[PDB]
């Protein structure tokens with residue numbers, strides 16, 4: 306009910322990062338940076354506010370992500386001078402996936418390693434439901450160039466995180482919104498049928514079945530690819546002794 | 547000091563007291579009671595289900611809104627109570643599903659009502675990309691494990707069709723993954739130092755690890771040029787059939 310700013314932070318969490326930046330769209334036309342701060346003025350001070358008055362949307366950075374998530378629920382679809390403000394988390398411009406993490410790698414060892422290409426805001430080695438590592442990681446930098454450095458250096462180079470000499474793999478993080486998704490308000494031939502199970506003997510069944518048989522050979526063939534890739538890697542694992 | 551003040555503002559339509567506002571609460575003092583647990587989270591409104599494991603030590607508590615359980619998470623995690631230091635996290639989801647091969651013109655509400663034929667859906671979502679286009683994937687979250695197993699089972703046996711186009715959806719079990727909390731330093735023996743005595747660095751060419759790392763690299767090079775043949779080979783058959 307009543308939050309103490311100046312005491313509202315997850316441990317280690319950094320302030321005014323790209324993760325606590327908001328996209329505020331479907332804006333009124335007379336909107337200014339001054340009025341932007343006014344809407345979010347209860348969430349404490351805000352960092353940068355960039356407002357594309359031509360496109361009718363803008364950005365504002367808050368202190369912590371939870372502050373922004375609070376804001377996002379209090380101000381989404383909020384009516385402002387005729388239009389309904391849409392409020393979402395902004396895309397991360399320097400987010401990176403890391404595969405082939407070793408063990409005894411930790412959120413901190415990652416932030417330490419990747420810090421060599423620029424300022425890291427966050428780095429987390431993703432853990433399964435049993436608390437163990439998956440081999441995947443997240444590394445979010447302060448700005449684009451540090452991620453283009455990290456991306457490029459780790460593709461041409463061989464970046465080893467531990468004594469074990471299998472280098473890590475580094476790809477850009479796909480910026481997908483899996484909270485709001487696609488509502489009906491957005492978006493007739495394709496709807497004129499309901500969700501149903503394709504019934505045997507029908508035309509739609511036969512096509513469904515033609516598709517599922519094509520996924521089969523696609524899986525069978527992929528399976529032979531990652532089968533001998535697996536055992537080649539596996540051979541390699543042996544010779545290290 | 548400066549503050550924020552809220553009240554009772556939840557979106558309409560959004561379901562409440564789902565698995566997604568359930569907090570795991572660990573490191574409990576052994577004399578913890580339910581009555582005392584609710585008083586603890588009473589800042590954040592009346593709470594739904596409260597569980598306390600038999601040997602005390604940990605429990606769970608449904609809050610109303612995911613965003614409400616966020617606020618309680620950061621204000622109460624690491625909080626001392628009777629000397630112990632509470633670990634607050636979100637509990638896992640026991641009834642979560644990813645769906646692939648979605649047809650176009652599917653929405654959160656359609657997906658939701660589609661999969662209700664198997665049980666109580668609490669959330670559906672059509673994952674979109676950076677330009678707000680559907681991604682072809684989606685999440686379906688049920689309230690109970692039996693519903694999500696039913697939706698799994700009936701969707702590998704049959705061809706579930708969400709629109710008129712006869713391309714059946716693919717329905718897999720949501721891999722439970724923590725990209726929020728990860729594996730901190732404090733949560734990690736002897737091979738530990740075997741492994742951690744080389745700092746992060748690049749392989750220096752002409753070294754017993756550069757030659758090895760190159761091998762690991764050449765296998766990635768193969769793996770990719772081989773999957774492309776398959777991509778090639780399948781995309782040809784895919785078009786034919788269509």
Ligand SMILES: *CC(=O)N1CCN(S(=O)(=O)c2ccc(OC)cc2)C(C(=O)NCc2ccc(OC)cc2)C1
Pocket residue numbers: 434435568570597606637638639640722
């Ligand atoms: C996903 C996850 O973190 N799990 C799976 C089961 N639970 S839970 O926290 O998801 C959960 C279970 C029941 C419930 O309400 C009745 C709410 C939440 C987990 C957990 O915390 N248990 C610890 C555990 C048990 C067993 C194993 O391996 C055999 C590992 C961890 C963990």
Ligand SMILES: *CC(=O)N1CCN(S(=O)(=O)c2ccc(OC)cc2)[C@@H](C(=O)NCc2ccc(OC)cc2)C1
Pocket residue numbers: 328393394395396397480481482674675676677678
């Ligand atoms: C990249 C970015 O800042 N966004 C966030 C706001 N929206 S979104 O609501 O579609 C969204 C997509 C992905 C996501 O990942 C976390 C979060 C939100 C975006 C958006 O609509 N950008 C404007 C735009 C400009 C041009 C075009 O051309 C098709 C489309 C959209 C993306």
